[PDB]
Structure formats: C-alpha cells, structure tokens
Amino acid sequence: MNLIETNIMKLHTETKKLWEDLVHQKSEHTTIEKTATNLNKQANQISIE
Amino acid sequence: KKNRIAILSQELLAKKQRLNAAQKKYQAHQVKLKNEEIMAKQYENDRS
C-alpha cells in the first residue's frame, strides 16, 4: 500500500504540474491569436485605403 | 492478525485502483499537452 500510494502522489503532482502548463500555453496561444487577427484587420483597412 | 491482514489486503486493492486512475489521468493529459504544443507551433507560424 505504501509504495502504491507513493506512485499515486508522484502521478498526481506531475498531473497538476501539467495542468498548470496547459493553462499557461492556452493563454499564450490565445494572446498570440488575438495579436495576429488585429494585425490582419489593420492590413485589410490598409487595403481599402 | 488475520482480520487486520484482510482489511489491509482489500485496502491494497483500493490503493492499486486509485494508482491506476492517477496513471490514466496523467497520461491522458500528457497526450493533451503534446497536441497543444503542436498547435502552438502552428499558430506561432500563422501569426508570423
């Protein structure tokens, strides 16, 4: 039981680490997408002009 | 001694089950991270 719970806690800690990494990269990519879209819209109105 | 031993054995079963659940969640979210980082590469390219 002791060693099973050892593996349990190792897995849980690494899983929480990875969930935080998930949130991190998700926000990174959301901001990247918004920047790209704004740049493209600038391009488009530049094209109308 | 036998009573306590049997209790410990069934609690062993439960702990093994929960360990396997932890492994499942860990590996699934690991796959998720792989996919998300691929997507990250793609969208950085696209913003460029």
Q: Which of A8, A22, A39 lies nearest to residue B29, judging by beta carbons?
A: A22
All residues of chain A having their beta carbon less than 8 Å from the beta carbon of residue B22 are: 7-8, 11-12, 15
Give the technique used to solve this structure: cryo-EM
Kindly report the backbone phi and psi dihedral angles of residue B22, in degrees, each rounded to the nearest multiple of 5, phi listed first.
-60, -45
DSSP designation for A3: H
Gap between the Cα atoms of A27 and A23, Å rounded: 6
Resolution of the solved structure (Å): 3.6
Distance, in Å, from the CA atom of A45 to the CA atom of A3, rounded to the nearest integer, reads: 64
Q: How far is B45 from chain A (nearest CA, A)?
A: 10
Residue B27: closest C-alpha in chain A: A15
